[PDB]
Design a protein around this ligand. Structure first.
Ligand SMILES: CCCCCCCCCCCCCCC
Ligand SMILES: CCCCCCCC
Ligand SMILES: [Cl-]
Ligand SMILES: [Cl-]
Lengths: 430, 451
């Protein structure tokens, strides 16, 4: 039995890596199309503005459609659903999710909306686990939860090419802490390592995000990151509040009727088509080009301006209900705000000879740490992506600080809240 | 009916997930700070006793006959100081110390901080300053654990959660103080106390708060300079990985074997002194003086371990020399640890693992010249695999290395060799060294109490 699981775990890990890489290029292409066909009519504005809006607006509707029609549970993140699956409180209908999630996400993210690939991959992988589990007629609690977990782990792993963060996210956030789930971390890790291998086979060494080697963080500077951490400690809960509000707002709008939902979906999707060409920092998955530029140099206000247009943009796309993630998007917000802070810090304290870069990094994982409450995952994730270990303290101070203050301030873990709302809404409706 | 019910109860456990009482939180910070201080204090102290020795030993440098005698005596006395203080005032302070902190977290073992704190400190200061093959984490983790319980007692916090959290926070802050590895410290806890979290007794935030405080005091007293500096090792192309899985297989076998040797040698020593304070304190001075000699003749066979090795081993040596220093240190760590001296077996394993990994590298680099392999990368890959298969904390091994080494481009090889060894060793009938020692320390506990 154990070797079987171990073996199966490894299979799910590999599959998830393939599907993941697949989705990741499948999204790039749809983007390449929309961009290569938008460069054609680029001659005159008479047909540039229209296409821009139409393409993404249409690609978005595709997404919203498939979800609302075939698989409702493929909307939004997906992580909350997988958590629900592990808790034996939510189904895993891969037969309609895998297709929907993949194609829908392909539309929505391809449209240029502000959503991440992690949400989708982690759920796809979560389901792949289940699938495999069923096409092998395995029915032990151990097998069920371990493979479901491996999928989830390997998924996030593949979304950021971050093996460590992958299991950390399972250990820290995915698995129901207060339960005997019978999940085998060693097995899950085996899956995660597989997916990482696949990732390498298809993308080589080259990391996703690429910062250089930033400066050091002398002791006499750490207090600043504490202050920076508090700022996120206040914004984190506030952000979850808005996510939940805005989510309600849309319900009142479409009442949940497909016709309407899909329509504003095209609306919201199109808005990202327009921003796409006029001030791009406002749209896009996020790190796609931002963390890197933010760790270079920018204007406090310009930086602080992008931050706000991105807050509204992410809230729209995510709350709307489209398949996609709030995770990655939050890492961008974090870097933005962290770079603004640090930008000011340098000026306000010349004696330190600071660099907004360090703060961009320090804050990269903090927003997510105050909203989702995965301090450890946030920190390690950032480490693997930016590889600047000389900033481990600033990173831990800022991220932990935000998390401490986020609870002390009334905040709740985002995923835990969204799941809560779905389990609440569930028994209620029915 | 049951599902509509399990939903109620679950949205509660969720909308209140990881929420830590402010008192514990506040104290975890105090406990972490305090542990780093006493932590770095110990490190300075051990380094001191070593300078006294090595310095007042180099004055009789030109007196060939007044050298070997001192090399023996100095280390012999110092070591004896350690063994004695342990055997007489606080027995639980002998050995690693982690298996006791582990027992404390399970209600199976008392934390007598009043005698262990000073005993372990000075005891470790002696045996380590002697030159014996012992790690400094042994003491620091136990010291940290004890400091945690102390604080807890003087402020009168009796809640099971405050108790389990600060004890664990002390342990983690201690582990990171020994290697300036914050993530590793916090991870050793997560990966080794799952049950503690299933019951809501420990909180990651609390432990993290404590660990980061010790990490800061460390920087305050030691600066940016890293414990050990390896270089920027080369990359590890996809076509290389299968090798690490093999190297991982070697460890999965050595792992369980080494653990038994640890236990068995621990027995030999037992039959010898039977338990009598003076037999023990003498065979301790012998083993300790023995290290004094190797100290100047065959230095690689002694010392804490990384104190000079995983850094020279990631540069250049020959396959035969490595295997020779390997087995030498395998027997040398056994003697020093199983004897009972206050000291860690953690860091010493990091060296056995690094050496063994360098050897495999060399062999591999030759057998497959097509890969252009640098032994160094395997040194790193294996630096944490032996401990990962003995202790069974693969995730800690990996992150610990990443933290001391800092060659993230080698994370795949690292994970493979470490997780591989662990899986295998477990499958092959292996037991967590600490769990085992704790189990045996409880067996011998009764074999007398109910005798
Ligand atoms: C593109 C070349 C294909 C070669 C694939 C080599 C795969 C080696 C991977 C070893 C992984 C060991 C995992 C152990 C847990
Ligand atoms: C040299 C003592 C400075 C202390 C700075 C502490 C910042 C958290
Ligand atoms: Cl997400
Ligand atoms: Cl130890």
């Amino acid at each position: 039995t154990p070797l079987a699981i171990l073996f199966m775990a490894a299979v799910v890990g590999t599959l998830t890596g393939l599907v993941g890489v697949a989705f990741e290029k499948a999204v790039s292409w749809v983007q390449n199309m929309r961009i290569g066909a938008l460069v054609q009519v680029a001659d005159h504005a008479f047909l540039l503005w229209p296409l821009a809006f139409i393409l993404s607006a249409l690609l978005a509707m595709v997404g919203y459609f498939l979800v609302r029609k075939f698989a409702p549970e493929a909307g939004g993140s997906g992580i909350p659903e997988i958590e629900g699956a592990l808790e034996e409180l939510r189904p895993v209908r891969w037969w309609r999710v895998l297709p929907v999630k993949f194609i829908g996400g392909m539309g929505t993210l391809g449209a240029g909306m502000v959503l991440g690939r992690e949400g989708p991959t982690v759920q796809i992988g979560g389901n792949l686990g289940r699938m495999v589990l069923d096409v092998f007629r395995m029915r032990s609690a151990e097998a069920r939860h371990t493979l479901l977990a491996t999928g989830a782990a390997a998924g996030l792993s593949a979304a950021f090419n971050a093996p460590l963060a992958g299991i950390l996210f399972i250990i820290e956030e995915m698995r129901p802490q207060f339960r005997y789930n019978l999940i085998s971390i060693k097995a899950v890790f085996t899956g995660v390592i597989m997916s990482s291998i696949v990732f390498r086979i298809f993308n080589g060494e080259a990391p996703i995000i690429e910062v250089g080697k930033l400066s050091d963080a002398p002791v006499n500077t750490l207090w600043l990151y504490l202050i920076l951490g508090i700022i996120f400690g206040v914004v984190g809960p506030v952000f979850n509040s808005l996510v939940l509000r805005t989510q309600d707002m849309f319900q009142r709008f479409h009442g949940g009727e497909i016709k309407k939902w899909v329509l504003m979906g095209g609306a919201i999707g199109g808005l990202c088509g327009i921003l796409g060409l006029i001030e791009p920092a406002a749209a896009g998955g996020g790190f796609n080009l931002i963390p890197i530029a933010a760790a270079g140099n920018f204007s406090v206000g310009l930086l602080l301006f992008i931050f706000i247009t991105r807050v509204v943009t992410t809230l729209l796309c995510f709350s709307s209900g489209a398949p996609g993630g709030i995770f990655a998007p939050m890492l961008a917000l974090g870097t933005l705000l962290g770079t603004a802070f640090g930008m000011a810090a340098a000026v306000l304290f010349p004696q330190y000879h600071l660099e907004a870069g360090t703060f961009a990094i320090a804050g990269m994982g903090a927003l997510m740490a105050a909203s989702v409450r995965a301090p450890l995952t946030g920190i390690v994730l950032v480490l693997e992506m930016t590889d600047n270990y000389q900033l481990i303290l600033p990173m831990i101070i800022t991220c932990l600080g935000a998390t401490l203050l986020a609870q002390f301030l009334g905040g709740k873990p985002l995923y835990s809240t969204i799941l809560a709302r779905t389990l609440a809404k569930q028994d209620a409706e029915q």
